[PDB]
Write an enzyme that holds these catalytic residues in place. Structure first.
Site, PDB file in Angstrom:
ATOM      1  N   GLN A 174    -150.474 152.868 -71.654  1.00  0.00           N
ATOM      2  CA  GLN A 174    -150.932 153.942 -72.556  1.00  0.00           C
ATOM      3  C   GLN A 174    -151.967 153.437 -73.529  1.00  0.00           C
ATOM      4  O   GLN A 174    -152.958 154.148 -73.870  1.00  0.00           O
ATOM      5  CB  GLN A 174    -149.765 154.677 -73.241  1.00  0.00           C
ATOM      6  CG  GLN A 174    -150.210 155.920 -74.013  1.00  0.00           C
ATOM      7  CD  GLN A 174    -149.078 156.585 -74.776  1.00  0.00           C
ATOM      8  OE1 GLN A 174    -148.179 155.950 -75.328  1.00  0.00           O
ATOM      9  NE2 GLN A 174    -149.118 157.877 -74.791  1.00  0.00           N
ATOM     10  N   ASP A 190    -155.215 153.043 -71.692  1.00  0.00           N
ATOM     11  CA  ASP A 190    -155.767 154.369 -71.400  1.00  0.00           C
ATOM     12  C   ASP A 190    -156.455 154.869 -72.686  1.00  0.00           C
ATOM     13  O   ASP A 190    -157.580 155.433 -72.634  1.00  0.00           O
ATOM     14  CB  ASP A 190    -154.640 155.322 -71.087  1.00  0.00           C
ATOM     15  CG  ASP A 190    -155.092 156.604 -70.731  1.00  0.00           C
ATOM     16  OD1 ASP A 190    -155.505 157.388 -71.623  1.00  0.00           O
ATOM     17  OD2 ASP A 190    -155.016 156.984 -69.490  1.00  0.00           O
ATOM     18  N   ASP A 195    -157.680 153.190 -75.168  1.00  0.00           N
ATOM     19  CA  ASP A 195    -158.945 152.448 -75.385  1.00  0.00           C
ATOM     20  C   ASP A 195    -160.103 153.093 -74.600  1.00  0.00           C
ATOM     21  O   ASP A 195    -161.227 153.178 -75.118  1.00  0.00           O
ATOM     22  CB  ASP A 195    -158.738 151.003 -75.011  1.00  0.00           C
ATOM     23  CG  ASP A 195    -159.771 150.083 -75.666  1.00  0.00           C
ATOM     24  OD1 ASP A 195    -160.980 150.348 -75.575  1.00  0.00           O
ATOM     25  OD2 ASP A 195    -159.373 149.083 -76.191  1.00  0.00           O
ATOM     26  N   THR A 221    -165.011 155.022 -76.525  1.00  0.00           N
ATOM     27  CA  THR A 221    -165.886 154.134 -75.850  1.00  0.00           C
ATOM     28  C   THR A 221    -165.308 153.722 -74.517  1.00  0.00           C
ATOM     29  O   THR A 221    -164.138 153.283 -74.499  1.00  0.00           O
ATOM     30  CB  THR A 221    -166.149 152.839 -76.652  1.00  0.00           C
ATOM     31  OG1 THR A 221    -164.980 152.037 -76.692  1.00  0.00           O
ATOM     32  CG2 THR A 221    -166.713 153.137 -78.068  1.00  0.00           C
ATOM     33  N   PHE A 239    -165.914 151.025 -72.825  1.00  0.00           N
ATOM     34  CA  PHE A 239    -165.559 149.606 -72.874  1.00  0.00           C
ATOM     35  C   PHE A 239    -164.146 149.380 -73.327  1.00  0.00           C
ATOM     36  O   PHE A 239    -163.607 150.112 -74.191  1.00  0.00           O
ATOM     37  CB  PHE A 239    -166.579 148.789 -73.728  1.00  0.00           C
ATOM     38  CG  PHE A 239    -167.993 148.998 -73.272  1.00  0.00           C
ATOM     39  CD1 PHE A 239    -168.443 148.444 -72.078  1.00  0.00           C
ATOM     40  CD2 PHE A 239    -168.819 149.912 -73.940  1.00  0.00           C
ATOM     41  CE1 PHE A 239    -169.711 148.748 -71.592  1.00  0.00           C
ATOM     42  CE2 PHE A 239    -170.090 150.200 -73.446  1.00  0.00           C
ATOM     43  CZ  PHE A 239    -170.543 149.608 -72.268  1.00  0.00           C
ATOM     44  N   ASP A 241    -162.447 147.604 -75.562  1.00  0.00           N
ATOM     45  CA  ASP A 241    -163.028 147.043 -76.783  1.00  0.00           C
ATOM     46  C   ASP A 241    -162.197 147.227 -78.037  1.00  0.00           C
ATOM     47  O   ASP A 241    -162.711 147.146 -79.184  1.00  0.00           O
ATOM     48  CB  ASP A 241    -164.405 147.605 -76.965  1.00  0.00           C
ATOM     49  CG  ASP A 241    -164.420 149.089 -77.156  1.00  0.00           C
ATOM     50  OD1 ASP A 241    -163.376 149.736 -76.949  1.00  0.00           O
ATOM     51  OD2 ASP A 241    -165.516 149.621 -77.471  1.00  0.00           O
ATOM     52  N   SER A 249    -161.275 149.904 -79.207  1.00  0.00           N
ATOM     53  CA  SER A 249    -161.699 151.086 -79.944  1.00  0.00           C
ATOM     54  C   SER A 249    -160.565 151.911 -80.452  1.00  0.00           C
ATOM     55  O   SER A 249    -160.768 152.753 -81.340  1.00  0.00           O
ATOM     56  CB  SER A 249    -162.687 151.939 -79.164  1.00  0.00           C
ATOM     57  OG  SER A 249    -162.215 152.237 -77.849  1.00  0.00           O
ATOM     58  N   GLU A 256    -148.429 160.053 -81.539  1.00  0.00           N
ATOM     59  CA  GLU A 256    -147.851 160.952 -80.547  1.00  0.00           C
ATOM     60  C   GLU A 256    -146.401 160.629 -80.116  1.00  0.00           C
ATOM     61  O   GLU A 256    -145.635 161.482 -79.915  1.00  0.00           O
ATOM     62  CB  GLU A 256    -148.748 161.086 -79.312  1.00  0.00           C
ATOM     63  CG  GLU A 256    -148.534 161.650 -77.903  1.00  0.00           C
ATOM     64  CD  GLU A 256    -147.786 160.818 -76.879  1.00  0.00           C
ATOM     65  OE1 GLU A 256    -148.179 159.655 -76.654  1.00  0.00           O
ATOM     66  OE2 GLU A 256    -146.805 161.329 -76.298  1.00  0.00           O
ATOM     67  N   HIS A 276    -147.328 158.489 -66.624  1.00  0.00           N
ATOM     68  CA  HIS A 276    -146.416 159.558 -66.963  1.00  0.00           C
ATOM     69  C   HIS A 276    -145.137 159.500 -66.174  1.00  0.00           C
ATOM     70  O   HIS A 276    -144.114 159.964 -66.646  1.00  0.00           O
ATOM     71  CB  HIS A 276    -147.116 160.925 -66.897  1.00  0.00           C
ATOM     72  CG  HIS A 276    -148.206 161.068 -67.949  1.00  0.00           C
ATOM     73  ND1 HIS A 276    -149.193 162.003 -67.849  1.00  0.00           N
ATOM     74  CD2 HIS A 276    -148.456 160.381 -69.090  1.00  0.00           C
ATOM     75  CE1 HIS A 276    -150.029 161.867 -68.865  1.00  0.00           C
ATOM     76  NE2 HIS A 276    -149.606 160.894 -69.657  1.00  0.00           N
TER      77      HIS A 276
HETATM   78  C1  HEM Z   1    -144.122 158.882 -74.115  1.00  0.00           C
HETATM   79  C2  HEM Z   1    -145.214 158.594 -73.405  1.00  0.00           C
HETATM   80  C3  HEM Z   1    -146.399 159.512 -73.231  1.00  0.00           C
HETATM   81  C4  HEM Z   1    -146.693 160.734 -73.782  1.00  0.00           C
HETATM   82  C5  HEM Z   1    -145.841 161.545 -74.833  1.00  0.00           C
HETATM   83  C6  HEM Z   1    -147.965 161.112 -73.270  1.00  0.00           C
HETATM   84  C7  HEM Z   1    -148.605 162.370 -73.581  1.00  0.00           C
HETATM   85  C8  HEM Z   1    -149.859 162.781 -73.104  1.00  0.00           C
HETATM   86  C9  HEM Z   1    -150.545 164.019 -73.489  1.00  0.00           C
HETATM   87  C10 HEM Z   1    -150.068 165.143 -74.385  1.00  0.00           C
HETATM   88  C11 HEM Z   1    -151.733 163.967 -72.909  1.00  0.00           C
HETATM   89  C12 HEM Z   1    -152.825 165.000 -72.955  1.00  0.00           C
HETATM   90  C13 HEM Z   1    -152.667 165.832 -71.728  1.00  0.00           C
HETATM   91  C14 HEM Z   1    -153.684 166.946 -71.548  1.00  0.00           C
HETATM   92  O1  HEM Z   1    -153.870 167.865 -72.384  1.00  0.00           O
HETATM   93  O2  HEM Z   1    -154.322 167.008 -70.472  1.00  0.00           O
HETATM   94  C15 HEM Z   1    -151.808 162.746 -72.155  1.00  0.00           C
HETATM   95  C16 HEM Z   1    -152.925 162.363 -71.474  1.00  0.00           C
HETATM   96  C17 HEM Z   1    -153.026 161.099 -70.860  1.00  0.00           C
HETATM   97  N1  HEM Z   1    -152.027 160.252 -70.598  1.00  0.00           N
HETATM   98 FE1  HEM Z   1    -150.302 160.215 -71.381  1.00  0.00          FE
HETATM   99  N2  HEM Z   1    -148.414 160.234 -72.345  1.00  0.00           N
HETATM  100  C18 HEM Z   1    -147.540 159.192 -72.343  1.00  0.00           C
HETATM  101  C19 HEM Z   1    -147.632 158.026 -71.554  1.00  0.00           C
HETATM  102  C20 HEM Z   1    -148.721 157.601 -70.829  1.00  0.00           C
HETATM  103  C21 HEM Z   1    -148.789 156.365 -70.120  1.00  0.00           C
HETATM  104  C22 HEM Z   1    -147.687 155.335 -70.025  1.00  0.00           C
HETATM  105  C23 HEM Z   1    -150.070 156.329 -69.594  1.00  0.00           C
HETATM  106  C24 HEM Z   1    -150.745 155.306 -68.761  1.00  0.00           C
HETATM  107  C25 HEM Z   1    -150.190 154.171 -68.338  1.00  0.00           C
HETATM  108  C26 HEM Z   1    -150.738 157.552 -70.002  1.00  0.00           C
HETATM  109  C27 HEM Z   1    -152.000 157.952 -69.672  1.00  0.00           C
HETATM  110  C28 HEM Z   1    -152.653 159.149 -70.046  1.00  0.00           C
HETATM  111  C29 HEM Z   1    -154.072 159.450 -69.819  1.00  0.00           C
HETATM  112  C30 HEM Z   1    -155.111 158.680 -69.130  1.00  0.00           C
HETATM  113  C31 HEM Z   1    -154.323 160.634 -70.322  1.00  0.00           C
HETATM  114  C32 HEM Z   1    -155.684 161.334 -70.326  1.00  0.00           C
HETATM  115  C33 HEM Z   1    -156.386 160.807 -71.662  1.00  0.00           C
HETATM  116  C34 HEM Z   1    -157.766 161.501 -71.723  1.00  0.00           C
HETATM  117  O3  HEM Z   1    -158.839 161.111 -71.137  1.00  0.00           O
HETATM  118  O4  HEM Z   1    -157.879 162.561 -72.335  1.00  0.00           O
HETATM  119  N3  HEM Z   1    -149.863 158.310 -70.641  1.00  0.00           N
HETATM  120  N4  HEM Z   1    -150.646 162.054 -72.238  1.00  0.00           N
HETATM  121 CA   LIG Z   2    -162.870 151.654 -75.691  1.00  0.00          CA
END
Ligand code: HEM
Ligand SMILES: [Ca+2]
Ligand SMILES: *[C@@H]1O[C@H](CO)[C@@H](O[C@@H]2O[C@H](CO)[C@@H](O)[C@H](O)[C@H]2NC(C)=O)[C@H](O)[C@H]1NC(C)=O
Ligand SMILES: *[C@@H]1O[C@H](CO)[C@@H](O)[C@H](O)[C@H]1NC(C)=O
Ligand SMILES: *[C@@H]1O[C@H](CO)[C@@H](O)[C@H](O)[C@H]1NC(C)=O
Ligand SMILES: *[C@@H]1O[C@H](CO)[C@@H](O)[C@H](O)[C@H]1NC(C)=O
Length: 595
Positions: free
Chosen positions: A105, A108, A110, A184, A186, A188, A190, A258, A351
Site C-alpha cells: 500500500q 502504491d 508513492d 509523482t 517516481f 521517491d 512522495s 485511511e 486488496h
Molecule cells: C486496509 C487496507 C486498504 C484499504 C482500506 C484500501 C482502500 C482503498 C480505497 C478507498 C481506494 C480508492 C478506490 C477507488 O475509488 O477507486 C483504494 C485504491 C487503491 N488501492 Fe487500496 N486499500 C487498502 C490496501 C491496499 C493494498 C495492500 C494495496 C497494494 C498492495 C492497495 C492498492 C491500491 C491502489 C493502487 C489503489 C489505486 C490508487 C490510485 O491510483 O488512485 N490497497 N484503496
Molecule cells: Ca512518487
C-alpha cells in the site's frame, strides 16, 4: 501531430540542470521531456482507452449499450457473487507477514493517485448522488442488484464519483478522457514529502534550520514523534469517534489516515527522516536545513526503493521477477517512467491480501489489553486508537507477527472491505471496495481481460472451457461467464486477480507482466534511481544496501526484537532476534569535509 498541447495545467516549471536533488513535482527528472513522471499529468496509456462512446462514457453507463454484444454486469453483483466470502478461518498467508500487505500500500501510494473530480463541494450534487442515486455527469453510482441485503438497509446505490481528468475539470472533449495521476510516478517517497510545493513546505520544520519534518506538538509516543495533525474541518478521523475528537494526520499523501496501519507506516517513515537528518547534522554541522532535508529525503527515497526492489517485488513477482525486472543496467532516458492507467488497477491485488482484523501486541508479542484484536472496519480513519491506545509500537509488532491474508479464488476480499468500507462524507461503514474497483476500471476506460492477456503475450480464452483452463478453476470461470458472457468483457481488476499465483509469488501471470513492466520502467526511467552511477557514491551504496525494514523498526520504535526478514511470516520468539544483530545504516560515507 500529437493532439498534445493538452492541457491547460500543469503549472509548467523550469529546471536547474545541475540540481543534485529531485523536484517535489517530479518535473525535470527526464531532461529532454521534463514533464515525464511529474505529478498532476495524465496517467499513461499503454493501450487506447475503451469507453462506451469512444471518448468518455464508461461501459455500463447506458443500459442498452452492450460491450461486444453483452451487457456488462453490475459491479456490486460481480462483487457479491464472486469476490465475497463468509469464513475467515484458514485464509491467512502462511508465508507473508501483515507488513507485506502494508508495504504494498505504501508503494502504491508513492506511485499513483487518481482523485475524484472535485465538483461536489460548494454544491449538493455530491450529496444528491448519494441521496437520489441519479446517474449524471460525474455521479456514477454503484447500483445494488435485487437480492442485495444492502438494498434492504442502505438504499438503492452506493455513491461513486468519476475520477479527475486532464485538460481538467470541465467535461470535454476530442481525444479520449485521460485520468490524472496526482502524485509523482517516481518511487521517491512522495508520500512522505508531498508531490506539490504548497504541501511539501507546510510539512517541513522551517523554524529550526535542522531540516526536520514538522512533528506533532500535542502528542508523543514514549517521546518518539507523531505526524502533525490536519486542519481540514470536517475530519473523517474525528467523525468516526466524535467523543475522542482526534483528527487525521498530515502527510505527503492525502490518504495516510485511511487505515491505522497506513498511518503507522507513515509514522515510521517521518521518524527515519529525522533520525537521518539529526544524524547528518551530528556528522556535518556546517550544512543548513535544506542540505540536511534534501540529503535525508534522498536517503529515504533510496530506502523505499531498496526495500521495494530487493525485498518486496521478488516475493510478489516470484518466478517472473527475473524476466520483467532483470539486474539493473543504469539510467535510460528513453524509458517512459510514467505510471500507466492499468497499473493503478493491477496494484490493487493488495486488496485481496488485507485480513479481517488488526492486532496490538506487547513486548512478549502477546495480546495488548483485553481488546487487542479489532475488526479492520473499526480502524478506518482511526487516529485516536494510536494516540490514546498505546502509540504505534503495539501495531508495529502486529505488522511483524501477524500475517497477510492470502488471495484465494473462493475467498477474495474480506467483508471488512467488501461491505464495511467507510468513505469520507458518506457517514456509514457500508461501502464495497471490490465493487468500487470494478466501477473504477470502467470509469477509467480500461480494456478488458483479453486485451491485457494479449498485451502480455498470454492466451485469450474465449469459451467457458478455455477460461477454466486459464484460471484452473471450473466454478470461478463459470461464475465469471454467467456474469460477463465473454472473457473479453471481464474487468481487468477481477480478471487479473482471478488467475492462480505464479510460483514463489503472490499474483498470477497477467498481473506479473503488468506489474513487472511498470516496475522495470519506474527503475530504468529514473535519473535519480539510488544505484544510478552519480546519484550516490560507491561507499554510500555499500552502506545503503545494509538497510532493512527490521532495522527501520529497531531505530524508530522501542521494539528490540525483530525478524531479519520482515516480510516473511515470522513467529515470536523463534524467528525473532535482538536488534543488535541486525546491520545498521552506516552513515560514515556522508561525511563531507569541504576544508
Ligand atoms: C486496509 C487496507 C486498504 C484499504 C482500506 C484500501 C482502500 C482503498 C480505497 C478507498 C481506494 C480508492 C478506490 C477507488 O475509488 O477507486 C483504494 C485504491 C487503491 N488501492 Fe487500496 N486499500 C487498502 C490496501 C491496499 C493494498 C495492500 C494495496 C497494494 C498492495 C492497495 C492498492 C491500491 C491502489 C493502487 C489503489 C489505486 C490508487 C490510485 O491510483 O488512485 N490497497 N484503496
Ligand atoms: Ca512518487
Ligand atoms: C471513542 O474514543 C473514546 C476515547 O478514548 C473511547 O472510550 C475509551 O474506551 C474505554 C472504555 O470506554 C476506556 O478505557 C477509555 O478511557 C475510554 N475513554 C472515554 C473518554 O470514555 C470510545 O470507546 C470510543 N468510541 C468508539 C465508538 O470508537
Ligand atoms: C522544529 O525544531 C525545533 C528544534 O528541534 C523544535 O523544538 C520544534 O518543535 C520543531 N517544530 C516542529 C513543528 O516540528
Ligand atoms: C533504452 O530503452 C529503449 C526502449 O525500451 C531501448 O531502445 C534502448 O536500447 C535502451 N537503452 C539502453 C542504453 O539500453
Ligand atoms: C517463505 O518465503 C521466503 C521468501 O519470503 C522463502 O525464502 C522461504 O523459503 C519461505 N518459507 C517457507 C517455510 O516456505
Amino acid at each position: 501531430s500529437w493532439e498534445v498541447g493538452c492541457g491547460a495545467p500543469v503549472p509548467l516549471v523550469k529546471c536547474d540542470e545541475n540540481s543534485p536533488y529531485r523536484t517535489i513535482t517530479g518535473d525535470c527528472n527526464n531532461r529532454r521531456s521534463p514533464a515525464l513522471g511529474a505529478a498532476n499529468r495524465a496517467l499513461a496509456r499503454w493501450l487506447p482507452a475503451e469507453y462506451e462512446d469512444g471518448l468518455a462514457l464508461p461501459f455500463g453507463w447506458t443500459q442498452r449499450k452492450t460491450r461486444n454484444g453483452f451487457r456488462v454486469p453490475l459491479a456490486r453483483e460481480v462483487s457479491n457473487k464472486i469476490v465475497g466470502y463468509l469464513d475467515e478461518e484458514g485464509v491467512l498467508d502462511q508465508n507473508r507477514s501483515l507488513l507485506f500487505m502494508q508495504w504494498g500500500q505504501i508503494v502504491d501510494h508513492d506511485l499513483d493517485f487518481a482523485p475524484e473530480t472535485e465538483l461536489g463541494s460548494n454544491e449538493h450534487s455530491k450529496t444528491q448522488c448519494e441521496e437520489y442515486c441519479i446517474q449524471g455527469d460525474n455521479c456514477f453510482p454503484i447500483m445494488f442488484p435485487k437480492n442485495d441485503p444492502k438494498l434492504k438497509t442502505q438504499g438503492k446505490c452506493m455513491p461513486f464519483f468519476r475520477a479527475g481528468f486532464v485538460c481538467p475539470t470541465p467535461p470535454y472533449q476530442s481525444l479520449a478522457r485521460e485520468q490524472i495521476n496526482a502524485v509523482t510516478s517516481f518511487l521517491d517517497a512522495s508520500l512522505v514529502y508531498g508531490s506539490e510545493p504548497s504541501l511539501a513546505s507546510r510539512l517541513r520544520n522551517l523554524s529550526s534550520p535542522l531540516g526536520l519534518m514538522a512533528v506533532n506538538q500535542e502528542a508523543w509516543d514514549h517521546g518518539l514523534a507523531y505526524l502533525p495533525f490536519n486542519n481540514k474541518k470536517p475530519s473523517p478521523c474525528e467523525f468516526i469517534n466524535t467523543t475522542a475528537r482526534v483528527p487525521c494526520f498530515l502527510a505527503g499523501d492525502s490518504r495516510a489516515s485511511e487505515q491505522i496501519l497506513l498511518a503507522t507506516a507513515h509514522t515510521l517513515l517521518l521518524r527515519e527522516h529525522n533520525r537521518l537528518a539529526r544524524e547528518l547534522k551530528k556528522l556535518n554541522p556546517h550544512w543548513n536545513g535544506e542540505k540536511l532535508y534534501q540529503e535525508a529525503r534522498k536517503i529515504l527515497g533510496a530506502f523505499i526503493q531498496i526495500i521495494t526492489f530487493r525485498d518486496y517485488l521478488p516475493i510478489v513477482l516470484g518466478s517472473e521477477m527475473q524476466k520483467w525486472i532483470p539486474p539493473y543496467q543504469g539510467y535510460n532516458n528513453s524509458v517512459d517512467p510514467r505510471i500507466s492507467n492499468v497499473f493503478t488497477f493491477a496494484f490493487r491485488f493488495g486488496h485481496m491480501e488485507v485480513p479481517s482484523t488488526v492486532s496490538r501486541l506487547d513486548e512478549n508479542y502477546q495480546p495488548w489489553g483485553p481488546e487487542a484484536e479489532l475488526p479492520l472496519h473499526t480502524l478506518f480513519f482511526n487516529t485516536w486508537r494510536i494516540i490514546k491506545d498505546g502509540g504505534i509500537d503495539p501495531l508495529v509488532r502486529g505488522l511483524l507477527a501477524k500475517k497477510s491474508k492470502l488471495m484465494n479464488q473462493k475467498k477474495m476480499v474480506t467483508s471488512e472491505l467488501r461491505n464495511k468500507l467507510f468513505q469520507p462524507t458518506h457517514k456509514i461503514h457500508g461501502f464495497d471496495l471490490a465493487a468500487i474497483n470494478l466501477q473504477r476500471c470502467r470509469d477509467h476506460g480500461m480494456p478488458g481481460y483479453n486485451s491485457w492477456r494479449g498485451f502480455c503475450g498470454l492466451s485469450q480464452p474465449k469459451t467457458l472451457k478455455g477460461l477454466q483452463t486459464v484460471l484452473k478453476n471450473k466454478i470461478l470461470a463459470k461464475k465469471l461467464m454467467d456474469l460477463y458472457k465473454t472473457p473479453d468483457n471481464i474487468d481487468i481488476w477481477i480478471g487479473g486477480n482471478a488467475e492462480p499465483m505464479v510460483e514463489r509469488g503472490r499474483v498470477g501471470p497477467l498481473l506479473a507482466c503488468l506489474l513487472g513492466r511498470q516496475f522495470q520502467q519506474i527503475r530504468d526511467g529514473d535519473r535519480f534511481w539510488w544505484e544510478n552511477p552519480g546519484v550516490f557514491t560507491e561507499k554510500q551504496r555499500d552502506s545503503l544496501q545494509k538497510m532493512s525494514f527490521s532495522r527501520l523498526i529497531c531505530d524508530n520504535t522501542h521494539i528490540t526484537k525483530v525478524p531479519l526478514h520482515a516480510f516473511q511470516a515470522n513467529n515470536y520468539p523463534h524467528d525473532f532476534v535482538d536488534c543488535s544483530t541486525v546491520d545498521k545504516l552506516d552513515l560514515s560515507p556522508w561525511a563531507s569535509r569541504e576544508n
